Structure 1
Amino acid sequence: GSMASQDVIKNLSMNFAKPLEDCKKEMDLPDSVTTDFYNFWKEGYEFTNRQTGCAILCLSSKLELLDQELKLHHGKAQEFAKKHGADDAMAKQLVDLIHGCAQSTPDVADDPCMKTLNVAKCFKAKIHELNWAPS
């Protein structure tokens, strides 16, 4: 049921966010990133600023999920989902959601942080639409 899928997204989310303290101390990120992460799955929550996108990129890099251009490595992202309990179909669906969001969010501003935050907002909305967002 939707609760089982939510549990996969919870496991993914918690493991993804584990190194946030390390990222904050390495990059001098504002404490607003920690607030945005606490509220990441809260329905109707809007993110604070582009530094939350920088935090998402730092967490992605620590988990070796980014390519050299700071874009998601689709294969590594799929495998990350499977290691946290996604079946191959669910993992492929999650990567397709991120890919669709990235195609809707070209990096016109040469700002990987703001582009990443916009992709994350789009991904969050798609996950709520599927009732896959954990409380």
Structure 2
Amino acid sequence: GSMASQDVIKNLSMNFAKPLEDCKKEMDLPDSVTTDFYNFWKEGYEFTNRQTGCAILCLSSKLELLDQELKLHHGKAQEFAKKHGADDAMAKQLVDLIHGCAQSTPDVADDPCMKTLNVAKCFKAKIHELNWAPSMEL
């Protein structure tokens, strides 16, 4: 049921967010990214700025979910999801949701941080629509 699917997202999210303090230190990210992560799954919450996108790219990179062009590694993102409780079907759906979101998000400004932040917003909305958003912070 919806709560068990939210717990997979919850598990994925906490694991994804673990090295955030290291990404903050390494890239001199501002304290607002920690707030944005705390509120990541809050309905209606609007992200501060592109630095939250920089934080998402760093976390992805640390989990080696990015390829050389700072784009999602589909196979590695799938396996990440499965190691944190997703079945093959759910893992594939999540990768499809991110990919769709990347495709419907043009990077006109050559700004991966902004683009990643817009991909994240698109992804968060899709998860909310599936009622797969947990009520717990990162």
Which TM class, normalised by the smaller chain length?
A: over 0.9
**Corresponding position of 2:33:** 33
Q: Deviations over 1:32-87 (max 9, x none)?
A: 00000000000000000000000000000000000111111111001100000000
Query: Superposition RMSD on alpha carbons, in Å?
Result: 0.4
Task: State the Cα distance separating 1:14 from its structure 2 match.
Answer: 0.1
CA distance in 2, matches of 1:85, 1:42: 22
CA distance in 1, matches of 2:23, 2:56: 9
- Residue 59 (structure 2) pairs with residue 59 (structure 1): yes
Task: State the Cα distance separating 1:102 from its structure 2 match.
Answer: 0.6
CA distance in 2, matches of 1:100, 1:118: 12
Task: State the Cα distance separating 1:108 from its structure 2 match.
Answer: 1.3
**Corresponding position of 1:50:** 50
**Corresponding position of 1:127:** 127
CA distance in 1, matches of 2:81, 2:19: 17
Task: State the Cα distance separating 1:105 from its structure 2 match.
Answer: 0.3
Structure 1: unaligned runs, 5 residues or longer: none
CA distance in 2, matches of 1:86, 1:67: 22
Structure 2: unaligned runs, 5 residues or longer: none
- Runs of at least 4 residues of structure 1 off by over 3 A? none
CA distance in 2, matches of 1:22, 1:84: 21
**Corresponding position of 2:24:** 24
Task: State the Cα distance separating 1:107 from its structure 2 match.
Answer: 1.2
Number of aligned pairs? 135
If the length of structure 1 is used for normalisation, what is the TM-score?
0.99
